[PDB]
Design a protein around this ligand. Sequence first.
Ligand SMILES: [Mg+2]
Ligand SMILES: [Zn+2]
Lengths: 153, 196, 190, 52
Amino acid sequence: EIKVVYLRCTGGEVGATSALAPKIGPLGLSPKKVGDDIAKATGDWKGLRITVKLTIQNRQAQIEVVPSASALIIKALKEPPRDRKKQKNIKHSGNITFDEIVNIARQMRHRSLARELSGTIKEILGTAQSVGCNVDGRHPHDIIDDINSGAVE
Amino acid sequence: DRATWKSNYFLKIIQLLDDYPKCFIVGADNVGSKQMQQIRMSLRGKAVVLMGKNTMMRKAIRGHLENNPALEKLLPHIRGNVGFVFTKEDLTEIRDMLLANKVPAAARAGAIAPCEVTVPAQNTGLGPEKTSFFQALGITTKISRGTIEILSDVQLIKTGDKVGASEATLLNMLNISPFSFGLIIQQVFDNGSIYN
Amino acid sequence: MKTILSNQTVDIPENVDISLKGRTVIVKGPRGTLRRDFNHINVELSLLGKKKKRLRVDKWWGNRKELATVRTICSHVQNMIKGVTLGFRYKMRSVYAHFPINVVIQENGSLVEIRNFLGEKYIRRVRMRPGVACSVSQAQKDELVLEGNDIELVSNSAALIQQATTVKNKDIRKFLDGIYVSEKGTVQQA
Amino acid sequence: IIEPSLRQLAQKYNCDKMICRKCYARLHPRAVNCRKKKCGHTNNLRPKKKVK
RNA sequence: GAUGGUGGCCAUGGAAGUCGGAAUCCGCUAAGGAGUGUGUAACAACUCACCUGCCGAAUCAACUAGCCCUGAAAAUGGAUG
Ligand SMILES: [Mg+2]
Ligand SMILES: [Zn+2]
């Protein structure tokens, strides 16, 4: 018997809000020793919203992070995170080039729910204006690149 | 706008018919967009399935009849929510693939029941906190091992029954949906021939 | 403006026979004979063609307030033809929260007595107008079946009992009680 | 305490109505202007707030 | 029928579109609006825009002026003579 459960964590921080107990409680597996393990396993994010799938068997669970386009672009837009102070208007400003957009799209096509590379770069360019940062310009400037001036595989 | 949306559709239906002298006239009836999208995404490399307005397709056929005098047979077969799928690989390999790519869809409240939906007696994993939905249907159940135990099977909906919200939610909770709708393709066009 | 001519035709099933006496109409079918008078509408009725397959109703030089009356006659005739060839069956269900509604049929459907409506001891006796029959149906807990020929009489009787089963001086948005018309149906299905 | 389909059947004759602002007439759910000529067949209507 | 990227981003105690401020785009698309509403502590669910299935000839909208109506309630019974 193999069970898979999807959870949402806040990154490398240990979840203060007890949300593992409502899920892992019914099967009897200890949730407190798994939540901190997920937090330390993620680690690098440490400031984002993270989705984690858990392959829990009758003996032990396996931890792996489900990739997300929004989670990848925000960590690509590296900025000093804000601590517990938690002020307003952390609207991210930055200029991420096109090179790493391709490799993020590789992770997007890894699970294979998309079109080919030329379509995934467009749908992640949509996520660029979704976040707020611009690739040396907005999507009106970044649409003509796909027209007769592309740099995609 | 609509004017160019009609023109380029005329362009893309002519172009699609130019290079595919073989097609299945497929009635995409009661098929979810999710199922259609995954089918098309999976089978894009082998075939292309196109849908649209029947009255516009038949006018395109009648407009192209001046160059293809063998397209009149398609005209009587265009009625209902029916489109085209084009492929050049084999004759029945895609037909078998379409028959195998059917996906069981969820039970929507308001749609007639196709055939023979019931629930066997078993110990689920829902829990004691969701028995109000079973009490709505009046199904007598017990609770054991911390979950809900079904005593006996029941034919909640017969063949050709209206699906209610209470039954639809119960089927969603049990993760059971015998409702499977796929391609119900009617005829085959192959260089001026009709096949079942 | 005044439209020169406005006409509509109604098909006539072979099992039924309809004839006109001036402007009133009489329809004879398997269930019985039903008549209706139209001496207040001032139109023309013509049973054109042998074997009485079609009936045409037309009006000449009528404003929009009276051209509307041309097609309502067609609906009346076709509804009447349905009520004579197949009849009308109105099924209405009793809705109550705590107190059951005791419905008793008397003088073979002519009178309906209602007891224990909201628990009050007052007995509601409603007399069906002639031409309809009431009966508490089987294969169901609470249900009343009204069978008749003309929709006016059948639905008027259903309205009478429905209006009789009313809650006053209270909030009707919570006290959802009374006998309510659930389904409009037909005695004989084609 | 009651079967839901019967409850909505009672609602269709008692709850889902449209009320005229003036004159406070009760109208069919798919109404546009009030039936009554007492208020002048005015256009403003409200959806008859349900029970909370 | 009415989908994914995606539970888009500031967001917040919980905010999956339905309380808020700025964005408001790409694939599959005949079509799906980071969305018109009903609701949810919030999710689910219902529903609208939009696209299709059936019949087939005309159909909407916003102004505008005529007659009539609501607006329009006083005392001795009452006046286009
Ligand atoms: Mg009171
Ligand atoms: Zn009014």
